[PDB]
Amino acid sequence: LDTNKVYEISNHANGLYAATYLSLDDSGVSLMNKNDDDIDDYNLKWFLFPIDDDQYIITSYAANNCKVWNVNNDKINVSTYSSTNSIQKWQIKANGSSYVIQSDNGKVLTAGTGQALGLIRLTDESSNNPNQQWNLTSVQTIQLPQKPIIDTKLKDYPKYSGNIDNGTSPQLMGWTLVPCIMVNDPNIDKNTQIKTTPYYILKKYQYWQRAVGSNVALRPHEKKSYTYEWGTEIDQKTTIINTLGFQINIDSGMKFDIPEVGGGTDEIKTQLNEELKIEYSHETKIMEKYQEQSEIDNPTDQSMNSIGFLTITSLELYRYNGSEIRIMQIQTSDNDTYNVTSYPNHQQALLLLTNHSYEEVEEITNIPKSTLIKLKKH
């Protein structure tokens, strides 16, 4: 189904609409006649958000604090979204001209009859029960932010000219839309949130940046030990975990948490993996700030300078109101991407030697032939 619409949901058999009481935040869901004398005290508007595996979350649209349909003992009420609560997940299955609405528990939405006319419950699906068929009527469509051009290849890390850049420019490597119900945005109310920014934009940028501590000066014929920093200096608790319900582990892979406030994004993890190209973590340790011991060897008779780069990943989340408003960012660096480069560039010299002569390389790199030979020696 389209998930950028506000829908009314009505029963095929009895023509009544699914509704909550506006003034009770934890309201049960009932069936009301759209011309009832008190219809203005109910909400009939529902917003569908898509989650993994062709399922949906059904959200009270700017009513009941944007709580979502929630099944308890075969009855439906609206409760705070929880990305770890299976009883809030739905399947909506086309069945001729209507739809069957099925809970994660396998039962289906059913209108009561007779003394129970007006009631809605979950029960077992029957062969053909008009009371288990539902119509979705679109009453509003919200135009969504358009996905921009995404890069697929990270530019090379900088090389010495002997000057060198401190990094490269951020490239957008992934972009995806996140249901507002899965976003804890403490600076806006939930009802205003769903009306103005029902989908947030989550971007992933990558680029290279100099590793702090990695600029090393070497004299002739010496090895020098050093340490560079990597990881993140950002507090994950107050940024990504409390906002989206996930953390970045030492692996640079993502790990899903139950946030202090908010429902989280556990139910869209496949979408995140695929659209942001972020691996699931294989570690248990959250990324912090680290120092990797390393060594530079200069086996030549000339001095040398070295510096290292890391691939930075920046995850940034934006409200979208006709423009993007950033509400969260975190940058991390991945020690498995560490690369060093030198001046004079011994690595470029050895590579050049695979299809150039010594005299040619000597000319290109300014490195003497005897050194070129020493270099090749190890």
CA distance 90 to 101: 7
Cα 295 to the center of its chain, rounded Å: 36
Contact at 8 Å (CB) between 348 and 361?
Answer: no
**Counting beta carbons within 10 angstroms of the beta carbon of residue 75, is it exposed (0 to 12), middle (13 to 18) or buried (19 or more)?**
middle
Please give the structure tokens belonging to residue 135. Answer: 């119509």
d(CA 350, CA 98): 69
Same-domain check for residues 177 and 322: yes
Matching residue, tokens 């039962």: 107
- In single-letter form, the type of residue at position 273 comes to N
216 and 278 assigned to the same domain: yes
Full DSSP string of 189-224: -HHHHHHH-SEEEEEEEEEEEEPTT--EEE-TTEEE
Written as one string, the DSSP assignment of 5-26 is EEEEEEETTT--EEEEETT-TT
Virtual CA dihedral for 182, 73, 135, 24, nearest 10 degrees?
-60
Distance CA 231, CA 316 (A): 17
Which helix H or strand E contains 298, and what residues bound it? Answer: strand 289-298
Whether residue 344 is preceded by a cis peptide bond, meaning omega within 30 degrees of 0, is yes
**Domains in the chain: how many in total?**
3
List the beta bridge partners of residue 222.
298
Dist CA 70 CA 88 (whole Å): 5
* 105 and 152 housed in the same domain: no
Cα–Cα distance between 220 and 148 in angstroms, integer?
50
Final residue before a domain boundary, out of 142, 175, 202:
142
For 209, the token pair is: 């940046």
Of 105, 115, 117, residue with least CA distance to 72: 105
DSSP H or E run through 115: none
Q: Judge contact between 4 and 141, C-beta under 8 A.
A: yes
318 shares its domain with 329: yes
Quote the tokens at residue 88.
């809030």
C-alpha to C-alpha distance for 203 and 330, rounded to whole angstroms: 11
Looking at the fold, whether 332 and 349 belong to one and the same domain comes out as no
Domain hosting residue 130, numbered range = 1-142
Tell me the two tokens of residue 114. Answer: 């007779």
Q: Note whether 203 and 318 are within 8 A (CB).
A: yes
Write out the E strands in 28-163: 30-32, 42-43, 46-51, 55-60, 68-72, 75-79, 90-95, 98-103, 108-111, 120-123, 134-141
* Residue 160, phi-psi category: left (phi > 0), alpha (psi -120 to 50), beta (remainder): beta
DSSP class of 377: H
Distance, CA of 345 to CA of 305 (rounded, Å) = 9
Judgement on whether residues 249 and 356 belong to the same structural domain of the protein = no
The DSSP element (H or E) to which 308 belongs, if any, is: strand 304-320
**Rounded to an integer, what distance in angstroms lies between the CA atom of residue 230 and that of residue 311?**
10
The C-alpha atoms of residue 324 and residue 223 are separated, in whole angstroms, by 49
Q: 354 and 268, same structural domain? A: no
DSSP string, 323-371: SEEEEEEEEEE-GGG-EEEEES-HHHHHHHTTSS-HHHHHHHH---HHH
Q: Is the domain of 71 the same as that of 206?
A: no
Domain boundary among 121, 142, 163: 142
* DSSP per-residue letters across 155-169: PPPP-------SB--
**Whole-number Å distance between alpha carbons of 222 and 216:** 12
> Distance between CA atoms of 286 and 253, rounded to whole angstroms?
10
Same domain, yes or no: 72 and 201: no
DSSP assignment string, 226-259: EEEEEE--S-SIIIIIHHHSEEEBTTS-EEE---
Tally of CB atoms within 10 A around 148: 9
Residue closest to 8 by CA, chosen among 61, 51, 57, 77: 61
Query: Closest Cα to residue 157, out of 232, 214, 207, 231?
Result: 207
**Contact, 122 vs 110, CB < 8 A?**
yes
Q: The domain that contains 365 carries what CATH number?
A: 1.10.10.60
CB 306 within 8 A of CB 312: no
- Token pair in block for residue 364: 């290109």
Q: What CATH code is carried by the domain that includes residue 138? A: 2.80.10.50
The technique by which this structure was obtained is X-ray
Other CB atoms within 10 A of residue 141 CB: 10
Q: Note whether 164 and 239 are same-domain residues.
A: yes
- What one-letter code names the amino acid at 318? Y
Residue that the structure tokens 């506000």 belong to:
6
- Cα-to-chain-centroid distance, residue 305: 39
Q: Residues 5, 135: one domain?
A: yes
DSSP state of 286: B
Do 243 and 339 share a domain, yes or no?
yes
Report chain breaks in the chain, C–N > 2.5 Å, as residues after which they occur: 161
From 142, 167, 185, give the residue that closes a domain. 142
Secondary element (H or E) of residue 373: helix 369-377
Give the pair of three-digit tokens for residue 302.
Answer: 């000339």
- What is d(CA 374, CA 378) in angstroms, rounded to the nearest whole number? 7
User: What is the Cα–Cα distance from 284 to 248, expressed in whole angstroms?
Assistant: 10
